[PDB]
Amino acid sequence: MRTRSTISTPNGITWYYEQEGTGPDIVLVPDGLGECQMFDSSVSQIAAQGFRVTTFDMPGMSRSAKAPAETYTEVTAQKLASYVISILDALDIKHATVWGCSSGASTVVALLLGYPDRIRNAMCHELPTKLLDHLSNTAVLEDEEISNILANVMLNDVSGGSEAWQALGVEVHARLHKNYPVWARGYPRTIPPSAPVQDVEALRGKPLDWTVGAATPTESFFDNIVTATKAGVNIGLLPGMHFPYVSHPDVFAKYVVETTQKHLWNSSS
Amino acid sequence: MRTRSTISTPNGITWYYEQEGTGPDIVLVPDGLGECQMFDSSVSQIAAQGFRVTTFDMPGMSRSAKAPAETYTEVTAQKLASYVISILDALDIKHATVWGCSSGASTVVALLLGYPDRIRNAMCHELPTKLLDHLSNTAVLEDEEISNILANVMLNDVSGGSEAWQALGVEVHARLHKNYPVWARGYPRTIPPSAPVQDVEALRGKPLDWTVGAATPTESFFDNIVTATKAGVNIGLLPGMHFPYVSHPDVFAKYVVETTQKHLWNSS
Numbered sequence A: 001m002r003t004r005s006t007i008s009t010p011n012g013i014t015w016y017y018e019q020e021g022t023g024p025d026i027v028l029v030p031d032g033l034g035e036c037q038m039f040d041s042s043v044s045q046i047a048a049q050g051f052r053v054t055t056f057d058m059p060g061m062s063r064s065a066k067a068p069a070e071t072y073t074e075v076t077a078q079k080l081a082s083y084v085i086s087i088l089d090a091l092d093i094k095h096a097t098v099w100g101c102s103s104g105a106s107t108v109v110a111l112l113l114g115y116p117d118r119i120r121n122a123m124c125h126e127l128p129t130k131l132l133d134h135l136s137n138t139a140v141l142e143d144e145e146i147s148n149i150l151a152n153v154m155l156n157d158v159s160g161g162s163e164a165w166q167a168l169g170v171e172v173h174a175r176l177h178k179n180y181p182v183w184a185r186g187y188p189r190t191i192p193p194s195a196p197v198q199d200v201e202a203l204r205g206k207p208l209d210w211t212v213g214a215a216t217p218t219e220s221f222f223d224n225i226v227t228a229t230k231a232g233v234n235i236g237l238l239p240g241m242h243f244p245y246v247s248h249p250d251v252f253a254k255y256v257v258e259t260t261q262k263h264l265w266n267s268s269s
Numbered sequence B: 001m002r003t004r005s006t007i008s009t010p011n012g013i014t015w016y017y018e019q020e021g022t023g024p025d026i027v028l029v030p031d032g033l034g035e036c037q038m039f040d041s042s043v044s045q046i047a048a049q050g051f052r053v054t055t056f057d058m059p060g061m062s063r064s065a066k067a068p069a070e071t072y073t074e075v076t077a078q079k080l081a082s083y084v085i086s087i088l089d090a091l092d093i094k095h096a097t098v099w100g101c102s103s104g105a106s107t108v109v110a111l112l113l114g115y116p117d118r119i120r121n122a123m124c125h126e127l128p129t130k131l132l133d134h135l136s137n138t139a140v141l142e143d144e145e146i147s148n149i150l151a152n153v154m155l156n157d158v159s160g161g162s163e164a165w166q167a168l169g170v171e172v173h174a175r176l177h178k179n180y181p182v183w184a185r186g187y188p189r190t191i192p193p194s195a196p197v198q199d200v201e202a203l204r205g206k207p208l209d210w211t212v213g214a215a216t217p218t219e220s221f222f223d224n225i226v227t228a229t230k231a232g233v234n235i236g237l238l239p240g241m242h243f244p245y246v247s248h249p250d251v252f253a254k255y256v257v258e259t260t261q262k263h264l265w266n267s268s
């Protein structure tokens, strides 16, 4: 059965977290919207293959909103990696496989490079490396204008599956609605320049598996494909766009399980 | 200022071709639909910058239909490259910059590798390397079915600009209508396995500039980005999808001119 609970870390964050299963640890880091209910179906499917799966809402977001302002303002990959290590310490997770999309992608690459003894392998999806002025400029609008604009962007531009996105349901969407202004004012100006992929040689030989959405327009994460290839990092596609865990939960779960299994084999070898 | 004419090559093809301008040669090879009126606006814009621009309908297609069946069946990159060299020979084009999309992309890479003395530099866009069973399977349908399926694919899925695609006009779409079954029966089963990108080391250091459409879904030409990166070939994006010369003719023309100028500087 699923643990659903809260835990406080010495940096002042009260996290909402979920955990299911027994076995090697897999940790699912949310994208910038910080909403771990997006993983619900996949958590059960991955845990059923013999893994302990942990996820959580991100600081300032959803049910992890009781957090100091520094944790959700001027956010960087390296700040988020420090926060994730804090909850892994609190939960006594010594060695983890990690997944992340978007700011979660930047976070898991920063985790693997910064805490190599802690991270078995990292899966990154759609890692943001470019400043986008039209998203950065939402930060000066009123809260309800930001929520209306970004709710529409998520559904129509990046969900990868409008029926699955809407089917997250009213409780989830009401939490996202409150998160959009927090994300807009804390993330888009500071996350892209923090991308831990400027040093291509630091990525070479690392246990990293990179994906982009099959349906994502080529221009969105073209740079990820180039960077991964230059570094000799395994690069491939998942169905859908920015939220494969929402649009295609069973394919997502299979990818996480298979990739974790590949690294468990290689680790013993 | 546009010459619109025909020329016969000793492989049996009577080509329809167009030429405009004076200067270094730039040759625009069509995609698999073989229809050079798609380049009309861009030909004038490129020639205006001091180039002689040549384009043509492809064998069996549109106004180059007077051709033997081998030129439009079981078509490979290597067959198409031989045909393009035959028209360049006939027009006394000794050195050319070449552009191609789709089967035209495979053609221009085959030209650059196979005929290096003839090719100043090649621009390839969206080069097909994978068999797609759903397109291969159109080859066994009736002609009217094939034309309806593929006309809809071009307009709604890969044009990169439906209004520009429709604005090609009734006469062009009537030619395309007849080309769809010829393309379906001769191209999709044989072009992808002939892709001249098996040897990444053969591409390294070559005067090749590769593009994908910015709006194309990542999966379609993901492998082009990986291959170009592995080879150290310049890889970038054009606006739109599979037909940048239709959807964004002025951006396309500027790209062709600037890329040609970059190689004219390097060659000196």
Ligand SMILES: C[C@H](O)CCC[C@H](O)CCC/C=C/c1cc(O)cc(O)c1C(=O)O
Pocket (backbone or CB within 6 Å): A032, A102, A103, A127, A128, A129, A130, A131, A132, A133, A135, A136, A158, A187, A188, A189, A191, A192, A220, A221, A242
């Ligand atoms: C930024 C990438 O280079 C290309 C992204 C293209 C997508 O279609 C835009 C929609 C999802 C936005 C992600 C995003 C954007 C931004 O301006 C800053 C960010 O920090 C993020 C982030 O946290 O993901």
Ligand SMILES: C[C@H](O)CCC[C@H](O)CCC/C=C/c1cc(O)cc(O)c1C(=O)O
Pocket (backbone or CB within 6 Å): B032, B102, B103, B127, B128, B129, B130, B131, B132, B133, B135, B136, B158, B187, B188, B189, B191, B192, B220, B221, B242
């Ligand atoms: C085929 C690519 O490998 C990857 C994605 C292709 C586009 O999205 C599909 C729409 C245009 C089709 C091109 C195409 C398809 C095919 O089955 C064989 C071909 O020879 C071609 C060709 O000559 O373009």
Ligand SMILES: [K+]
Pocket (backbone or CB within 6 Å): A247, A248, A249, A250, A251, A252
């Ligand atoms: K699925």
Ligand SMILES: [K+]
Pocket (backbone or CB within 6 Å): B247, B248, B249, B250, B251, B252
């Ligand atoms: K244009």
